[PDB]
């Protein structure tokens, strides 16, 4: 005989704790430094695994080579802090919420990190405004 | 107007990748060394955030002390490797599967790491037997 059990809510509970840890700045091993014209650089701390889990681009970036130990700082250009903030929040929560006139720029930021699900959703939202 | 989107399956997909990373032994920042009487220590590579997300014991263990630089090796005693394996698998997949006659020792491990859900399921199983 075999005992089996699965907790249906597990991955949502778990992500809830991981997001708490991100906001507390605990266990974080990467800092995203986001530089946008004529405004100060912003910093977002996160966990590489979590970014990897949602984005093949971050996955490739953090499994390639092997970086000298500790806090990695990654320079990001071409994307507003607030777009990156929203992609990060998506990785950690499963949700994103954006002013309708800026959906195009979020989409492009999701393109850049190959977050296909938010690329599609953005796209479908733009197509129903035609 | 506002644009709103949630991907309902996101957290299952993302745990699927995190689990692949664990099995490919990439990005790992902790190696558990599990020692058990008259058997050599077994190693298990995992991601601290992930273990912390599923176990307050792991959470406390990795948030206490200093922001560790790189791979930490951690001695563990009082749990067979295979019990730890199944708890780690549970953390990363939401599922655990064990032969009936060892449910008790799995329950004990889940108590040790304060995985409450698997404690309750193991209890439930042992009472209706
Ligand atoms: Ca408890």
Curated annotation (Swiss-Prot), chain B:
Cross-link N5-[4-(S-L-cysteinyl)-5-methyl-1H-imidazol-2-yl]-L-ornithine (Cys-Arg) (interchain with R-135 in KEAP1) per UniProt, renumbered positions: 102
GO cellular component: actin filament; centriolar satellite; Cul3-RING ubiquitin ligase complex; cytoplasm; cytosol; endoplasmic reticulum; inclusion body; midbody
Any GO BP: cellular response to interleukin-4
Impact after mutating residue 102 to S: Substitution with a small side chain that prevents covalent modification by an electrophile; promotes constitutive ubiquitination of NFE2L2/NRF2 and subsequent repression of phase 2 detoxifying enzymes
Domain named BTB: residues: 28-100
Leader peptide range in chain numbering: none
Single GO term (MF): ubiquitin-like ligase-substrate adaptor activity
Positions of crosslink type N5-[4-(S-L-cysteinyl)-5-methyl-1H-imidazol-2-yl]-L-ornithine (Arg-Cys) (interchain with C-151 in KEAP1): 86
Protein localization: Cytoplasm; Nucleus
Modified residues (S-(2,3-dicarboxypropyl)cysteine): 102
Site (Sensor for electrophilic agents): 102
Post-translational modification: Non-enzymatic covalent modifications of reactive cysteines by electrophile metabolites inactivate the BCR(KEAP1) complex. Accumulation of fumarate promotes the formation of cysteine S-succination (S-(2-succinyl)cysteine), leading to inactivate the BCR(KEAP1) complex and promote NFE2L2/NRF2 nuclear accumulation and activation. Nitric oxide-dependent 8-Nitro-cGMP formation promotes cysteine guanylation (S-cGMP-cysteine), leading to NFE2L2/NRF2 nuclear accumulation and activation. Degraded via a proteasomal-independent process during selective autophagy: interaction with phosphorylated SQSTM1/p62 sequesters KEAP1 in inclusion bodies, leading to its degradation.
Keywords: Cytoplasm, Kelch repeat, Nucleus, Repeat, S-nitrosylation, Thioether bond, Ubl conjugation, Ubl conjugation pathway
Disruption phenotype: Early postnatal lethality caused by abnormal cornification. Mice survive until weaning and probably die from malnutrition resulting from hyperkeratosis in the esophagus and forestomach that cause gastric obstruction. Defects are caused by constitutive activation Nfe2l2/Nrf2, leading to constitutive expression of phase 2 detoxifying enzymes. Mice lacking both Nfe2l2/Nrf2 and Keap1 reverse the hyperkeratosis phenotype and are healthy and viable in normal conditions.
Residue numbers carrying S-nitrosocysteine: 102
Modified residue annotations for S-(2-succinyl)cysteine: 102
Written domain comment of the UniProt record: The Kelch repeats mediate interaction with NFE2L2/NRF2, BPTF and PGAM5. KEAP1 contains reactive cysteine residues that act as sensors for endogenously produced and exogenously encountered small molecules, which react with sulfhydryl groups and modify the cysteine sensors, leading to impair ability of the BCR(KEAP1) complex to ubiquitinate target proteins.
Role summary: Substrate-specific adapter of a BCR (BTB-CUL3-RBX1) E3 ubiquitin ligase complex that regulates the response to oxidative stress by targeting NFE2L2/NRF2 for ubiquitination. KEAP1 acts as a key sensor of oxidative and electrophilic stress: in normal conditions, the BCR(KEAP1) complex mediates ubiquitination and degradation of NFE2L2/NRF2, a transcription factor regulating expression of many cytoprotective genes.
Family statement drawn from the similarity comment of this UniProt entry: Belongs to the KEAP1 family.
Subunit: Component of the BCR(KEAP1) E3 ubiquitin ligase complex, at least composed of 2 molecules of CUL3, 2 molecules of KEAP1, and RBX1. Interacts with NFE2L2/NRF2; the interaction is direct. Forms a ternary complex with NFE2L2/NRF2 and PGAM5. Interacts with (phosphorylated) SQSTM1/p62; the interaction is direct and inactivates the BCR(KEAP1) complex by sequestering it in inclusion bodies, promoting its degradation. Interacts with NFE2L1. Interacts with BPTF and PTMA. Interacts with MAP1LC3B. Interacts indirectly with ENC1. Interacts with SESN1 and SESN2. Interacts with HSP90AA1 and HSP90AB1.
Protein name, UniProt field: Kelch-like ECH-associated protein 1
Species of the source: Mus musculus (Mouse)
């Amino acid at each position: 005989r075999t005992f089996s059990y699965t907790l249906e809510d597990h991955t949502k509970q778990a992500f809830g704790v991981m997001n708490e840890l991100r906001l507390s700045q605990q266990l974080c091993d990467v800092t995203l430094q986001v530089k946008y014209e004529d405004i100060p650089a912003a910093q977002f701390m996160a966990h590489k695994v979590v970014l990897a889990s949602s984005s093949p681009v971050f996955k490739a970036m953090f499994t390639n080579g092997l970086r000298e130990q500790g806090m990695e700082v990654v320079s990001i250009e071409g994307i507003h802090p607030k777009v990156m903030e929203r992609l990060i929040e998506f990785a950690y929560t499963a949700s994103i919420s954006v002013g309708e006139k800026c959906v195009l720029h979020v989409m492009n930021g999701a393109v850049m990190y190959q977050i296909d699900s938010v690329v599609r959703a953005c796209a479908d939202f733009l197509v129903q405004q035609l």
